[model samples]
Target: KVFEVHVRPKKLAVEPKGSLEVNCSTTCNQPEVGGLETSLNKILLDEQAQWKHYLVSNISHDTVLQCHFTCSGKQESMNSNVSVYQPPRQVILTLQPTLVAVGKSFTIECRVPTVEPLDSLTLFLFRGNETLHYETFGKAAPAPQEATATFNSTADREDGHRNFSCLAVLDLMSRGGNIFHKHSAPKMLEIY
Candidate 1:
């Protein structure tokens, strides 16, 4: 007979505090020779004739679960990837000087104070109904952290007293197949 082990749910995506329930099953008669391994803390919920149920917690980290079974000394293993994500905490839009001189170049900083997996996040700067700037974080730390995007522009008399806001979108569709969005409070900038 072929010795086989399977980890149910090859992929799982959840929030930082969410919990996971999974099962490992084996085809070998000696199920005691195999078990599941992972970095996060897990509790063996129950054991059936051919399967072991596990409950995993503290899902803030990107974790993987491995199930191994050995029959007659030879071993086989299977794995499941778990992706953890947190939405943007807050976004802030600010002008370098709080106000800008008409026709003079000025800087705008759009700050996202907290988020997870920055590489999957995108930031947008809006001037009322218009999109002034957009940014995508690339090659960023997968852990939760702050991120900002800055851009330079010149304002004219027509741009006086404009409402500016920053928006953050965390694309976790690859992990949980879901998207999260947050927008900052509007900040009025004066061009004198």
Candidate 2:
């Protein structure tokens, strides 16, 4: 008989400082198999264990987890991959045609320079305390290590001396259940 092993979630993403709960199970076709040993990152999970939950912490890099079954000189194993990452460090806001005339259209761009495996993102354009526009971006291919959103609006006379700001809110798969938020310094749109 052959040994069988299974690990939940063949691949997983986690935050740099977060933890992962990996579940593993092992079975042997032959009763002669002594026991099962599960390990993550070369650390032994336990001795003579069938099923167990392993907690992995302080993940800073890709980790290889394995569950090994051995009995009567026969061995079988299963492996899982864990990826750890950090969220965007900074977000910048820029305006095209910084010099604007009343009733003229201008564009605002919000950019997140660094991130990985982003789940979702929302860009908010604000004038002082009020939000003038917003754009929502959903999950896409390539996992957008860098993300950008833009908004177009017509300038009004009241926009003079008004401070505009951009806020980026991101939900990253790497963060597990956490959220990332960044706000750019307010910039004034010179009105002619």
Off by over 4 Å in 2: 1-13, 16-40, 47-50, 53-83, 138-143, 173-175
Tally clashes: model 2.
Answer: 0
* Backbone Cα, N, C clashes tallied per candidate: 0, 0
Query: How many pairs of residues collide in model 1?
Result: 0
lDDT of candidate 2 over 62-137, digit per residue (tens): 6777755565677777777776655567878887899988899999877776665444666788987889887665
In candidate 1, position 18 carries an lDDT of: 81
RMSD of each: 3.1, 5.5
lDDT of 1 by residue, 1-192 (tens): 578889888777787778898898888876557678988889999987677889988887788899887777788889988887778877888887777788888787888866777778899988878998898886653334668888887876766756778899998877653788999998876777
Checking candidate 2 for backbone clashes, the offending pairs are none
Q: Give the TM-score of candidate 2.
A: 0.63
